[PDB]
Amino acid sequence: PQFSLWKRPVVTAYIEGQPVEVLLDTGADDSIVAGIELGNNYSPKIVGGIGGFINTKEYKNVEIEVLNKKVRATIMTGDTPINIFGRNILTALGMSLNL
Amino acid sequence: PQFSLWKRPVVTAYIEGQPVEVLLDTGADDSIVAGIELGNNYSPKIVGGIGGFINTKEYKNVEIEVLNKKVRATIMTGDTPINIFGRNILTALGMSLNL
């Protein structure tokens, strides 16, 4: 699959069976999704985002399926306006920026 | 060429021949660089950063040269901690996210 960049590259991932609309974002290092109640195995973490640091549950080994590629990968959970899939997941997905 | 995303995708662009390092950010709509002095034909904009607005100057038709591909594009300058090339320049360069 190939995302034209003429529109925002949003897509539906299935995080552990649950569907979320996420932005494929090569300028972000890690991911962070709002909405899914995800698990019981989380370290606390923090992330900035517009303003400053807010509180996130960071999960390891989560199952993400995107465009029929299922993958296990870390992800974080908290309040964002945008659900971001950063480079941590883009690389597990096998994605690349092309010429 | 295709770029994997193991590292931050940072490249030397040339803006009117002047080299700056920029982050290829598919997560960004627009583009903004600091430290470039592009002139007086611009319109004032204000763009929201994490923790507040910054005031910017928007220039049209600027010659960008990235990876041997020369295009013209709109570009803002302002005090940004990172020089981002958002989608408005990624599309002009013919760049795509691939899976």
* Best residue of B5, B32, B68 to probe chain A, by most A CBs closer than 10 Å: B5
- CB neighbours of B4 closer than 8 A, spacing ≥ 6? A91, A96
Q: Are A56 and A76 in contact (CB under 8 A)?
A: yes
For residue B37 the two structure tokens come to: 């002095």
Nearest CB to B5; choose among A3, A67, A97: A97
Give the whole-angstrom CA distance, residue A75 versus residue A38: 10
Contacts of A97 in chain B (CB under 8 A): 2-3, 5, 9, 24, 26, 95-98
Contacts of A90 in chain B (CB under 8 A): 5
Q: Are B19 and B11 in contact (CB under 8 A)?
A: no
Distance (Å) from the alpha carbon of A60 to chain B's nearest alpha carbon: 18
The CATH architecture that domain B1-99 belongs to is Beta Barrel (2.40)
Q: Are B80 and B49 in contact (CB under 8 A)?
A: yes
Contacts of B97 in chain A (CB under 8 A): 2-3, 5, 9, 24, 26, 95-98
Residue type, B23: L
From the list A86, A18, A27, the residue with the least C-alpha distance to B82 is A27
Give the whole-angstrom CA distance, residue A84 versus residue B27: 8
Question: Which residues partner with A62 through β-bridges?
Answer: A73
Coil vs helix vs strand at A67 = coil
From the list A28, A27, A16, the residue with the least C-alpha distance to A66 is A16
3-state percent breakdown (helix, strand, coil) of chain A, nearest 5: 5, 50, 45
Searching chain B, which residue's CA lies closest to the CA of residue A23? B27
Q: Are B94 and A6 in contact (CB under 8 A)?
A: no
A30 is catalytic: no
Q: DSSP alpha helices (H): ranges in chain A?
A: 87-92
Q: Do B27 and A95 touch (CB under 8 A)?
A: no
DSSP annotation of B89: H
What technique solved it? X-ray
Searching chain B, which residue's CA lies closest to the CA of residue A47? B50
Q: How many CB pairs under 8 A join A and B?
A: 108
- CB neighbours of A26 closer than 8 A, spacing ≥ 6? A87, A90, A97, B5, B9, B24, B25, B26, B27, B97
Q: Are B95 and A5 in contact (CB under 8 A)?
A: yes
